[PDB]
Subunit: 127 residues, 2 copies
Amino acid sequence: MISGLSHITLIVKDLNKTTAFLQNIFNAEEIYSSFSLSKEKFFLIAGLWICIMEGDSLQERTYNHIAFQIQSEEVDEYTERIKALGVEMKPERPRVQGEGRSIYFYDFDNHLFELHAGTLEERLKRY
Amino acid sequence: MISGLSHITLIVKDLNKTTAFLQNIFNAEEIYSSGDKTFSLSKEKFFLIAGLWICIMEGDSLQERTYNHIAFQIQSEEVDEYTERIKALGVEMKEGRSIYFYDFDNHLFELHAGTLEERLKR
């Protein structure tokens, strides 16, 4: 069986610019930096290992994405933080009852990120 | 501050085919299903894989393959086992430490043997 999540790998055209992005918004803690076969850095974000690699590859924008957990009270604060950095944010997404609030925004390489204030239990409860 | 991972959302063309893929390889447990084509409401399912909430929504597959991907952890002793199990599904694969393969929607997945924590020793 699967032990769990190992890490998430994102390819970006500008590693230093993305690094700043992650450190500002996610309080990402760099724990590794690339003789290396590629320019990459590993960050620890809320217990999750995120690997960023510099490269030309660019995935078209889609709803395939990662969602991090935040508390309801923090929605406005993160909204202000994203707004401050001029990063593109999505408008309010339609929701069903039991589905908590979320914020959606992009990095500089078509990666959509979600900050979700809801829970799985609430979602399944009504269900 | 961000307390951790909430969930991972993937878009796939065939939800029933993907569900089989998830259950077979990752021992994914379906815990939720919604959708009503007569109500113009697309299909969506929730699965639990090693305690992780995975949301799957039916839609378009990724247009091209890129190195952006998710990596799940397994045991080193399990590398050969998972290699063969993946092969049995006909999906394309790119006893070491990492297995790379795609599902039917151009999503690159990685099965990593060992912990990145231990990986740090370059």
